[PDB]
């Protein structure tokens, strides 16, 4: 049990780092889509999908 708990904690740390990177990527994608819509190349549905993914 001691060994299992140790390794579970380590795995949690790694997963947290991965999800942080994912969040950064999705945020930048949302920024790009919103800017493109403002400039007039896409529709509102794309912004809604980007917001859902974020």
């Amino acid at each position: 049990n001691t060994a299992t708990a140790y390794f579970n904690v380590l795995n949690a740390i790694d997963v947290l780092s991965y999800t942080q990177a994912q969040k950064e990527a999705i945020y930048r994608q949302l920024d790009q889509t919103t800017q493109r819509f403002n400039v007039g190349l896409v529709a509102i549905t794309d912004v809604q999908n980007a917001r859902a993914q974020y």
Partner: protein, 49 residues
């Protein structure tokens, strides 16, 4: 397309292509205008007789 590039939200090749397209369209318009001017050299805006 320019403002997206200003913020670095598109590739630079996309801006190069758009600018080159503008230049090429300008050149084609110049060709057409000079052709029309060449045709008008034979009339000089005089009556039919």
């Amino acid at each position: 397309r320019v403002p997206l590039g200003n913020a670095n939200l598109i590739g630079r090749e996309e801006l190069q292509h758009a600018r080159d397209a503008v230049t090429s369209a300008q050149a084609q318009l110049d060709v057409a205008i000079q052709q029309y001017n060449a045709n008008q050299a034979m009339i000089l805006g005089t009556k039919l007789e």
